[PDB]
Amino acid sequence: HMEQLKHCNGILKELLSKKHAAYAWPFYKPVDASALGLHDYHDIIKHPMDLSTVKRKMENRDYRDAQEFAADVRLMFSNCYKYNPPDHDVVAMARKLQDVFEFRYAKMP
Ligand SMILES: CCNC(=O)c1cc2c(-c3cc(C(C)(C)O)ccc3Oc3c(C)cc(F)cc3C)cn(C)c(=O)c2[nH]1
């Protein structure tokens, strides 16, 4: 649906907005596993995902509906919960950004 993909663009703009920048910044671009020295990142995480990829796919018209967009946003959060130990800062940041996503996605007209 054309209407819900327009609402999804709104959610994405909100996730990228300066208001959430303190906990949203680790999700803006792909995890730079080389620069961070995370040698096992692409062994554990088979399907990496981040907000720039979500934005490129939306511009490309890769999502058929809102459900396909949500699956990618949740993949991004799940990768973070799968890779990291529950005590890491990035996990707490993921939880905070997901609460923003889940709320806006639920309130979708
Ligand atoms: C089990 C160990 N896990 C990690 O080392 C780990 C690092 C990362 C990063 C991440 C990505 C980048 C850049 C922009 C270079 O891509 C920069 C820093 C990042 O993380 C940190 C954050 C958020 C705060 C810190 F004080 C320190 C670090 C390292 C993102 N995501 C989603 C992760 O899931 C992840 N896990």
UniProtKB/Swiss-Prot annotation:
Homodimer. Interacts with E2F1. Interacts with (acetylated) STAT3; promoting STAT3 recruitment to chromatin. Interacts with CTCF; promoting BRD2 recruitment to chromatin. Belongs to the BET family. The lineage of its organism: Eukaryota, Metazoa, Chordata, Craniata, Vertebrata. Residues 3-108 form the Bromo domain. Chromatin reader protein that specifically recognizes and binds histone H4 acetylated at 'Lys-5' and 'Lys-12' (H4K5ac and H4K12ac, respectively), thereby controlling gene expression and remodeling chromatin structures. Recruits transcription factors and coactivators to target gene sites, and activates RNA polymerase II machinery for transcriptional elongation. It comes from Homo sapiens. It comes from the Eukaryota. It is found in: Nucleus; Chromosome. The gene is BRD2. Changing N84A: Abolished binding to histone H4 acetylated at 'Lys-12' (H4K12ac). This is Bromodomain-containing protein 2. The first bromo domain specifically recognizes histone H4 acetylated at 'Lys-12' (H4K12ac). It also specifically binds histone H4 acetyl-methylated at 'Lys-5' and 'Lys-12' (H4K5acme and H4K12acme, respectively). The second bromo domain recognizes and binds histone H4 acetylated at 'Lys-5' and 'Lys-12' (H4K5ac and H4K12ac, respectively).
